[PDB]
Structures are given as structure tokens and as C-alpha cells.
């Protein structure tokens, strides 16, 4: 599924990541359009040999199993086709324990280059929440 900008505002509101570990709404906005261009299917493989996987670009190196990152960690406990899914939730519910687990948002390299610094509210702007 491609979600419209608001639409996924408020589906990412719903799902709790407004503020969640201090990052409001708008940041999370921004990091999926530059990750995924809002396109949930989206996948993108990584030179180590991992892919990436939906809205946030969920790598299988830690996070989920693909059957094919030899040595890999699966720390959400899913497979990452679970996280292509137009139900956001797997992935809200994954990209809440990457983004506790030390290094915040910059897990996303889209959001550490594109969103961090910037006037990340302008991605709310406009839509009823
Ligand atoms: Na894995």
C-alpha cells in the first residue's frame, strides 16, 4: 500500500509513535517518505548481504528473518514479510524497539541525513490529527 501523507500520520498516531522515546510525529513522517517513499512493499538490499523492509526500512541484519542473512538476528521475532504488510502494526511495533535500543533515530540513515535539524512539523502540517 502507498499511503498519502496525512493518512500515515495518523496511522503512526493511532499506532503510538507521537513523541515516543521524544521524537514527535512529524520526525517519523519524514524518515518513511525518505526510507520507503510511504510505500509499505518497499524493499531494498544492503551490500552485507541484509535487505530492508517496508515503511522504515527494517533491516534483516537485526530486526527480522528473511530466510537468506546468514548469522543474522530476528530481535522482533518476525519474518520481515510481516513488515510489507498494508497493517502498519508490525512495523510500528518493531520500529518502537530499534529506536529504544541505543541510538535513537539514527538507525534510519534517511532521517539522521534528510530529517534530522530540519522543521520535521512540516510534515503534519495540514492533516487532522
Ligand atoms: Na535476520
Known amino acids: ?3 498519502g501523507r496525512c493518512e ?3 496511522a503512526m498516531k493511532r499506532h503510538g509513535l ?3 522515546r521524544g521524537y514527535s510525529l512529524g520526525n517519523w513522517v519524514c524518515a518513511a517518505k525518505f526510507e520507503s517513499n510511504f510505500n509499505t512493499q518497499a524493499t531494498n538490499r544492503n551490500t552485507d548481504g541484509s535487505t530492508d523492509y517496508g515503511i522504515l526500512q527494517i533491516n534483516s541484519r537485526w530486526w ?3 530466510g537468506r542473512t546468514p548469522g543474522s538476528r530476528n530481535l522482533c521475532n518476525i519474518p520481515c514479510s510481516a513488515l510489507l504488510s ?3 502494526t508490525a512495523s510500528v511495533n518493531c520500529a518502537k524497539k530499534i529506536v529504544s535500543d541505543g ?3 539514527n538507525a ?3 532521517w539522521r541525513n534528510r530529517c534530522k535539524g530540519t522543521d520535521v512539523q512540516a ?4 492533516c487532522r490529527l
Open 1 to 3: 500500500k502507498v499511503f
Open 8 to 10: 500515515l500520520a495518523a
Open 18 to 20: 507521537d513523541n515516543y
Open 64 to 66: 527480522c528473518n528473511d
Open 86 to 88: 498494508s497493517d502498519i
Open 103 to 105: 541510538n535513537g533515530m
Open 108 to 110: 534510519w540513515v534517511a
Open 123 to 126: 510534515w503534519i502540517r495540514g
